[PDB]
């Protein structure tokens, strides 16, 4: 769990808070024309 500290200088005053960091990649959606095939037919996705 990688952390980074966030420090803000409010004029003379300072407030600091440590927040967790992580990265997300994305999503994949797979679309198939049919769910039941037969030997010989073509699968399109």
């Amino acid at each position: 769990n990688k952390f980074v500290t966030v420090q803000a200088t409010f004029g003379t005053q300072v407030v600091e808070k440590v927040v967790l960091v992580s990265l997300q990649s994305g999503y994949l959606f797979i679309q198939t024309d049919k769910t039941i095939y037969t030997p010989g037919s073509t699968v399109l996705y």
Partner: protein, 49 residues
């Protein structure tokens, strides 16, 4: 079945032999459907309204 065919079957009856519905098990669902078509992609490029 030999007893059944000896008792309830007659060669001169002139009445058709009784037929019984099979009423089986293990019934299999359909698995053959027409193949898919229209496998093409297009880009809309007309001036939007």
């Amino acid at each position: 079945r030999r007893q059944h065919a000896r008792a309830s079957h007659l060669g001169l009856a002139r009445s058709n032999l009784d037929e019984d519905i099979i009423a089986e098990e293990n019934i299999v669902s359909r698995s053959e459907f027409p193949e898919s078509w229209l496998w093409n992609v297009e880009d809309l490029k007309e001036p939007p309204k």
